Amino acid sequence: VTALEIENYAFPPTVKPPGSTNNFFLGGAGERGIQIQDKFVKFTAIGVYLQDIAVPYLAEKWKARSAHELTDTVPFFRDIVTGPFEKFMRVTMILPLTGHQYSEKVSENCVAIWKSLGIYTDEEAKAIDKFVSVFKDETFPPGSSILFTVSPSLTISFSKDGSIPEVETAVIENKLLSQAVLESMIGAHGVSPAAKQSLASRLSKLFK
Numbered sequence: 001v002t003a004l005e006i007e008n009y010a011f012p013p014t015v016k017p018p019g020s021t022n023n024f025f026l027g028g029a030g031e032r033g034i035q036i037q038d039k040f041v042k043f044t045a046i047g048v049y050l051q052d053i054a055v056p057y058l059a060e061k062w063k064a065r066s067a068h069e070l071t072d073t074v075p076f077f078r079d080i081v082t083g084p085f086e087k088f089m090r091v092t093m094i095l096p097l098t099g100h101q102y103s104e105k106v107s108e109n110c111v112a113i114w115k116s117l118g119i120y121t122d123e124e125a126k127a128i129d130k131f132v133s134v135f136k137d138e139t140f141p142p143g144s145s146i147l148f149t150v151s152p153s154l155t156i157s158f159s160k161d162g163s164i165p166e167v168e169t170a171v172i173e174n175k176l177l178s179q180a181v182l183e184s185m186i187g188a189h190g191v192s193p194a195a196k197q198s199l200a201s202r203l204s205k206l207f208k
């Protein structure tokens with residue numbers, strides 16, 4: 001596939017997440033913004049990479065549907081989130097964020113929606129606690145990146161720019177946390193509609 005450039009940040013077509021050794025391709029990328037006082041403040045640029053094997057898996061079930069169709073289909077993105085393949089997310093900050101600011105916002109989203117499905121055990125709370133522990137002292141100037149590998153486990157890595165380090169920072173062995181992080185971005189209530197549309201556009205075409 002092709003590379004994508006989002007808000008002056010470049011996402012190449014392939015990456016090598018640090019922990020894994022599988023091949024990944026850029027499924028899509030998009031900005032993430034919030035609405036404050038009449039203005040859409042763009043905070044991050046998100047790149048969603050998928051393991052190569054995701055194309056045959058998704059091609060079987062989502063072939064013959066237009067990009068417009070896939071964007072609305074909620075089960076299409078749930079398959080991207082939960083499929084039996086690795087996912088890698090790059091979150092590059094457009095505006096500066098502290099790790100506490102980032103993890104707290106990640107935290108409530110993940111905890112509340114887990115209460116939606118009545119799957120919130122005391123284990124996920126421990127996963128959340130570790131997640132917050134990873135981010136506690138981190139700071140993320142413009143251009144720095146938060147890297148997530150979602151594996152059938154969540155691997156967390158940090159970079160001061162857009163490059164991928166050779167060694168992660170932490171691994172959290174929880175399947176729901178690893179999935180929630182990605183759901184919070186490209187899910188039904190996903191904070192990056194633009195990443196969803198990029199994913200819809202690029203994967204449907206790949207299915208051809």
Ligand SMILES: O=C1C[C@@H](c2ccc(O)cc2)Oc2cc(O)cc(O)c21
Pocket residue numbers: 032043044046091097101102105106107109184185191
């Ligand atoms: O990429 C971001 C930005 C982050 C954020 C924005 C502004 C702010 O003040 C604090 C955090 O919120 C998020 C929350 C998520 O669940 C997943 C995400 O990818 C993100």
